[PDB]
Design a protein around this ligand. Structure first.
Ligand SMILES: Cc1cc2nc3c(=O)[nH]c(=O)nc-3n(C[C@H](O)[C@H](O)[C@H](O)COP(=O)(O)OP(=O)(O)OC[C@H]3O[C@@H](n4cnc5c(N)ncnc54)[C@H](O)[C@@H]3O)c2cc1C
Length: 447
């Protein structure tokens, strides 16, 4: 049987991995529009910030290694169209320009996304960058050592915009983060966490310009000024980290798209077309916190979906278990993680929640290594079942969030987490740990 896999990023790659496990006898074709197989964009900041020196080491598979395993790898080859009834696709070698058609029995696509760009005047000036993949990683890195970047404005205050801000701020530059949102990281954290992160960012000389609409880019030849509705900001570099467009317009009319380009798929990753499967940033995923489907553009998601697309190749047997949308990141000295519903996700779903925050030393009083840790536990007002949590400390407590991910999944309640057995040892935590204490507080709040 022959199986074509589009994309060598997370969903693409994991579909050929599981093809090699469940279907090791199938003719597999792995296509990649670009020159490099499997770059880890999620490694960009360690490279940018200097901890990883070789940008080609920031990857997790090579074409060659897959070819060692029987996989037909065509990089620099772009699938230009899918003909689903005809069971064929059209590909175009981008280095020679040759067009060709390939037949498939099953096709699995993970075309992913592309940075959203602001269609504002000046949008064509030099030095207005994006942050995704290897060429942007290299170009961005050279700017961190350029003697002429003095001020850089990153537009967008989410995971990526803050990673960029931190990288160029540590690089020695003057960074300003501009965004219409009024809190940095609001998609990930609630106000009681992002105020601490705004002060930590500001101490590292970043200006957080929230509540501002970027109007226009000004400059002569190369960008010189980013001007917003309430201010004009100097800029020798702009990094645009505002959103991701689905890379699906080429599928308009071939497969069924959601009003925002996202490919419609079911629990077994099937598209509206027979024998075409779609996975990764360009799809929705089962969000178990509120029993719904939501787009959560994360590595972890595309990888589990890439594997499930393969499991359901012949027949719909393993429905996707769903995810909670867990994330973790360190912003200068603070390491935070969160999973499930927070203020913004609850607003976006129109889901009413109740919650508590406990900010205290996560180690007992007598232990000299004690530090504040912040934990917020969000639950359902009627069932008190766990809907999400956020934690943050200069001590890395991030692994605690995986527990919360499984409690939400398992529909546990604040009473369950209140007396859940979590180990205590005084060099490691307090007798009722971080999770038990917030839940004990929620219980008390619901007495
Ligand atoms: C800066 C950055 C940091 C991130 N950090 C994290 C993190 O730390 N943790 C985490 O969970 N996630 C992180 N993510 C999100 C994560 O990287 C994405 O969710 C992940 O890339 C999965 O995307 P995907 O496999 O659907 O495809 P994408 O990553 O969008 O890539 C799709 C691939 O398919 C190729 N392709 C597309 N169309 C064609 C075509 N027609 N023919 C042939 N090839 C084609 C593209 O060139 C590309 O190589 C981050 C993303 C970025 C940009």
């Amino acid at each position: 049987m022959k199986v074509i896999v589009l994309g060598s990023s997370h969903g693409g790659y994991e579909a050929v991995e599981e093809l090699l496990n469940l279907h090791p006898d199938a003719e597999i074709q792995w296509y990649e529009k670009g020159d490099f197989i499997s770059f880890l964009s999620c490694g960009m900041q360690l490279y940018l910030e200097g901890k990883v020196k070789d940008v080609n080491s920031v990857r997790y598979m090579t074409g060659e290694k897959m070819e060692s395993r029987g996989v037909n790898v065509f990089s620099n080859t772009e699938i230009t169209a899918i003909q689903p009834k005809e069971h064929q696709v059209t590909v175009k070698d981008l280095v020679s320009g040759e067009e060709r058609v390939e037949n498939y029995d099953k096709l699995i696509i993970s075309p992913g996304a592309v940075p959203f760009e602001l269609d504002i005047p000046g949008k064509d000036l030099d030095n207005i960058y994006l942050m995704r993949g290897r060429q942007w990683a290299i170009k961005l890195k050279q700017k961190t050592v350029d003697p002429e970047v003095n001020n850089v404005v990153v537009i967008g205050s989410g995971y990526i915009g803050i990673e960029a801000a931190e990288a160029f701020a540590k690089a020695g530059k003057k960074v300003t983060v501009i965004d219409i949102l009024d809190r940095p990281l609001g998609v990930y954290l609630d106000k009681e966490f992002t105020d601490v992160l705004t002060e930590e960012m500001e101490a590292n000389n970043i200006t957080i310009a929230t509540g501002e609409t970027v109007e226009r880019y000004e400059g002569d030849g190369r960008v010189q000024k980013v001007v917003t509705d309430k201010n004009a900001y100097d800029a020798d570099l702009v990094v645009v980290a505002v959103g991701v467009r689905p890379n699906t317009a080429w599928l308009k009319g071939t497969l069924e798209l959601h009003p925002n380009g996202l490919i419609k798929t079911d629990e077994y990753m099937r598209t509206s077309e027979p024998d075409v499967f779609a996975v990764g940033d360009a799809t929705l995923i089962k969000y178990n916190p509120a029993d719904t489907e939501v787009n959560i553009a994360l590595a972890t998601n595309a990888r589990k979906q890439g594997r499930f697309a393969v499991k359901n190749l012949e027949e719909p047997v393993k429905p996707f278990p769903g995810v909670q949308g867990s994330s973790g990141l360190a912003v200068f000295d603070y390491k935070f993680a969160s999973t499930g519903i927070n203020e913004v996700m609850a607003q976006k779903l129109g889901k009413e929640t109740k919650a508590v925050t406990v900010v205290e030393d996560y180690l007992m009083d007598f232990n000299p290594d004690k530090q504040k840790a912040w934990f917020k536990l969000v639950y359902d007002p009627e069932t008190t079942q766990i809907l999400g949590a956020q934690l943050m400390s200069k001590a890395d407590l991030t692994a605690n969030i995986n527990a919360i991910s499984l409690a939400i999944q398992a529909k546990m309640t604040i009473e369950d987490l209140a007396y859940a057995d979590f180990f205590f040892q005084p060099a490691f935590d307090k007798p009722w740990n971080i999770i038990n204490t917030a839940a004990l507080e929620a219980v008390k709040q619901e007495r």
